[PDB]
Amino acid sequence: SADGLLASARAIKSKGPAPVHLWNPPFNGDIDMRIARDGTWFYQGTPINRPAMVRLFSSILKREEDRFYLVTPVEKVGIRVDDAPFVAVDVEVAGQGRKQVLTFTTHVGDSAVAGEGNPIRMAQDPATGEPAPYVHVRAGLEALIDRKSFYRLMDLGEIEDGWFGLWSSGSFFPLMTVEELER
């Protein structure tokens, strides 16, 4: 129907994240694309080991309600996202204590400064029931924070009014109860 993976990638050009909320093209169907929980894109069930192309398609990700699309000015297609569209693979701290700022980098190279504009959210693992936290990157597209980055964040956490969590950019993001941290 009737332009494929590589052809579609050749039609896109991006210097960066596209202003997809300017665009409301008609829906052309769902494609067999799935962003796995670990950030891997699958096409027709086969992974794409191709970070350039993953960055290119990621530039045109758009969230509507709870679903995800790839959107250009002329076309919109639905994709499947298992969990978050991105994985946060790095976190950088600056400053100290309650004044600290956390800058995250995602697996496609985007940067998100944690704070009110890009909040950190606590969720639990569907599977484990263990804490799985996210950070907002843009326009409702969130990054799941990976193990390596999570464990470094534990060491930069703080307690305020019953909750263990993270200060970034002057705002406090609860992650779990004190009770929970103590377990």
Residue numbers in the entry: 10 to 192
Q: What do the study's own words say?
A:
To extend the structural coverage of proteins with uncharacterized biological function, we targeted Pfam protein family Pfam06938 (DUF1285), for which we determined the structures of two representative members. The structures revealed a conserved core with domain duplication and a superficial similarity of the C-terminal domain to pleckstrin homology-like folds.
The crystal structure of SPO0140 was determined to 2.5 Å resolution using the MAD method. SPO0140 is an α/β protein comprising two domains. The N-­terminal domain (residues 10–93) consists of a β-meander–α-­helix–β-meander core (residues 24–92), with the two β-meanders hydrogen bonding along the first and sixth strands to form a twisted mixed six-stranded β-sheet. Two N-terminal helices (H1 and H2) pack against the sheet and complete this domain. SPO0140 crystallized with two monomers (A and B) in the asymmetric unit. The largest packing interface buries ∼810 Å2 of solvent-accessible surface per monomer and involves mainly helix H1, strand β1 and the H3–β4 loop from the N-terminal domain and helix H4 and strands β14–β15 from the C-terminal domain. The results of analytical size-exclusion chromatography (anSEC) support the assignment of a monomer as the quaternary state in solution for SPO0140.
